[PDB]
Structure formats: structure tokens, C-alpha cells
């Protein structure tokens, strides 16, 4: 296994883990809170994405 | 401190932590990989957001 392959697998595992935990955590809040948090998370995701576009 | 307050603080801390780790991890990849991962992460973020809209 190459370092590039090992890295790719590790990153895939990491993103999967983060997503699973986030979903489980969100599932603890009532509908109202969930909607607010989701709206905030999406706006922040767009901001991070635009920052990446700027870097590349 | 109310349970609602304790929950809000815990969620804020969690989202902050996840973001910091993600950024640090991304910083390990070369420009090319970073761009690919960012594009994939954004598309997935949009998918999750649309799923939330559907639930609420």
C-alpha cells in the first residue's frame, strides 16, 4: 500500500466518522433546534467552500 | 444552568471541534487533493441540507 492510498483511506474513514457523529448528535435536538442548526451549518459550509475556491 | 443552555454550549463546542480537526486534516493534503475533497464535501453538505429541509 502506497502512502497516497493509505492517506485516501484514512481521510474517507475520518469524513465518514464525523458525519455519523454529527447526525447522531443532531438527532438529540427537537425539530426547531435541528432546523436552526442545519441552516447555520449550511451557511458555514458555503463559506468554507468559497474560501477553498479562493485558495485554489 | 438549564438543560437547554447546557445542550447549546455542548453543541457549539462540538461543531467548533469538528471544524478545527477537519481544517487541520485538509492542510495535510496537496492543493490538488484539497480541491477534490472540498468539492465532494460541499456537494454532500448540500445533500444533507436538502434532506433536512425535507424533514422540516
Residue A48 neighbours by CB distance under 10 Å: 17
Q: How far apart are CA A38 and CA A8, in angstroms?
A: 28
Go through B16-29 and write b for each residue having 16 or more CB atoms within 10 A of its CB, e for each that does not: eeeeeebeeebeeb
Residues 23-42 of B with CB under 8 A from A: 25, 28-29, 31, 34-35, 37-38, 41-42
Greatest pairwise CA separation for chain B in angstroms: 47
Domains parsed from chain A with CATH numbers: 1-56 (1.10.287.230)
Which of A49, A53, A55 has the highest number of chain B CBs within 10 A, making it the mutation to test binding with B?
A49
Q: How far apart are CA B34 and CA B20, in angstroms?
A: 15
Surface-to-core class of residue A17, CB atoms within 10 Å of its CB (0-12 exposed, 13-18 middle, 19+ buried): exposed
Q: How far apart are CA B42 and CA B38, in angstroms?
A: 6
Which of A21, A48, A50, A55 has the highest number of chain B CBs within 10 A, making it the mutation to test binding with B?
A48
Query: What approach was used to elucidate this structure?
Result: X-ray
Chain B nearest CA to A10, separation (Å): 10
Amino acid at each position: 500500500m502506497t502512502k497516497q492510498e493509505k492517506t485516501a483511506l484514512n481521510m474517507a474513514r475520518f469524513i465518514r466518522s464525523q458525519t455519523l457523529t454529527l447526525l447522531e448528535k443532531l438527532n438529540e435536538l427537537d425539530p426547531d433546534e435541528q432546523a436552526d442548526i442545519c441552516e447555520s451549518l449550511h451557511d458555514h459550509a458555503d463559506e468554507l467552500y468559497r474560501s477553498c475556491l479562493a485558495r485554489f
